[PDB]
Amino acid sequence: MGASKLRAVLEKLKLSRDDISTAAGMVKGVVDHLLLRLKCDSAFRGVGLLNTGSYYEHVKAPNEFDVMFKLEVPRIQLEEYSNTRAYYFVKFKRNPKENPLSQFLEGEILSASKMLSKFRKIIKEEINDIKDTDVIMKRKRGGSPAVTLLISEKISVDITLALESKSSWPASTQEGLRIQNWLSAKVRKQLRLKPFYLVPKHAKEGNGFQEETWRLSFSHIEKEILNNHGKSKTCCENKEEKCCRKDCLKLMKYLLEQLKERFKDKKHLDKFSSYHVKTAFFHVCTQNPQDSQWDRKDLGLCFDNCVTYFLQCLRTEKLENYFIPEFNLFSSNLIDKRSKEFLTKQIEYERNNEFPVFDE
Template identity: 50%
Template sequence: VLSRLSLARQDVSEASGLVNRVVSQLIRAIRSKEGSFGRIERLGAGSYYERVKIFEPNEFDIMLVMPVARLQLEECDDTGAFYYLTFKRNPKEKYLLKFLDEDGKLSAFKMLQALRDIIKQEVKNIKNVEVTVKRKKAGSPAITLQIKNLPAEISVDIILTLEVQQSWPPSTQDGLKIEQWLGRKVRGEFRNKSLYLVAKQNKKEKVLRGNTWRLSFSHIEKAMMNNHGSSKTCCESDGPKCCRKGCLKLLKYLLERLKMKYPKELEKFFSYHVKTAFFHACVMWPNDTDWHSEDLDHCFQKYLGYFLDCLQKSKLPHFFIPQYNLLSPEDKASSNFLSRQINYQLNNGFPIFQEM
């Protein structure tokens, strides 16, 4: 199954080459338009960049990162993940003042609107390939580009991200429990990295004002994915191979196939649930010997068992913000449904894997 899930190298490089060309042109245009986005940088995120992508290479996430000197973070609910952002005193970034709302909060909505307008103009100037900007999805922090690349289309989510050089907020204090897995030193290095915030609507808010931002750790997730062994040589060309990424790919595939079959019942589930459970599993079984490549079958069942346990208890703590439960009890019916579907697959030798 895994060999069929690995993307054909040529497809990947063709698709990513096209995406790079389009995004580079957009970034040049965004930087040159006016002061607001002059220092914007690009950061690849998501499964393609972590080398755990499955199916066609037709979906990409690109984070456009804006450095900001200092921000005041105010929690806007009890998850510890969503924040209102205000400036301390006189900000260096005077050009951001026009994006404040009437309460002095930095408006994700206003910033996304300005960025979207620039991108909509610039896609008209892209030569030799047809690029369109998709209509806004409510609550989504992304500006989505559709690139015609016959016979398929490539979808690129552009995510507006702020990078702040300040310590992580208190809600993250007990997260990232990787001491036994990757080591205390690595945890310290990760926590010294910048704080990233993405424009993301908090669905719990009664009135959707578009002024909330969510913590993002995709830069750390990418680092953990690409250096996932408790020993430094794990999965290097001449080092021992493990099956960690293989297990993750299988569960991602299982969820994606089930979502195709039952889109309505499983609309609340995303690959981020599977990825979060994966990081917790890496902590529960921290040694490379727990994930021998030849034990893929056994390791996958172990990881799957943990995920099923989370579904049954409606409890999957965010890996970096432990108070934030990604499986809320009010979605218990969806969790039960997914649990039943996975158990059916498990007890019948995963017929869904034969349908590839």
């Protein structure tokens, strides 16, 4: 695929500032309401919106949003669950006083499900009485840490509770975030000085879930490297330094979206998500650390790079969490071989036919 061809695909996907800002305005209204309602509970007194510029997650298009509600909690003490590397039990270093989160304490262990339940119940209670905006809560999605809302039958919002820890990141992330040769060792240090988050997504335990466990999240870091993405500090600030990194990611996401859409009737692509694509993309960024390897005229080659890497990940059934290297997002235990073989074949068909998926 030629570079100009690929950018013509993105150009026709570009949304009008009006349709975007209207969409953003609706979710902000709902979010503002939920935040203040939430503050009426002592346990969520500390809730606040984490890292949101309210830019949508779908390319097409401005109908889906992903928000995290960060909760500042006292010094946290983690205990890794069954060496899963990403899931943890949360305990408090000092709990002699009857904590505000004490109601969610099952033993010395802060229950993810109990918090998630109340969080959800509080939100569901304010959804009936929202002024001027029609809002509905979606069914619980299997295994999701998120409360999903649908605004005006058009806009989906994922609202995810997020415990904030200012402690240093857990050992499982020691070899993660390999950005040294790309964004530099000192950027990695400064990033790792920032807080990490815990969302109420439970580890698998037999036919069910270990309902107390939380999972690590670094969406704030993911946000930072996407918007400050070059080896050069002035990457994408002038004509002579315009790179195609953001375009590649968009095209990879739109490819996955379109395929998921085409084959909704089948079940094969249901477990794949833009998070897989974003992760695959970060790895490619690490493999191609130079801004010259992401030249604007090379969008064609760079996109194929991303496609090819993603394909290798599907075939070998290995896609490392960018922050937690021993967590395999593509293990056969999460996504079975057939689904990955199906996605593999469709992407390959697309590439061999000049991406019919990319035209209207």
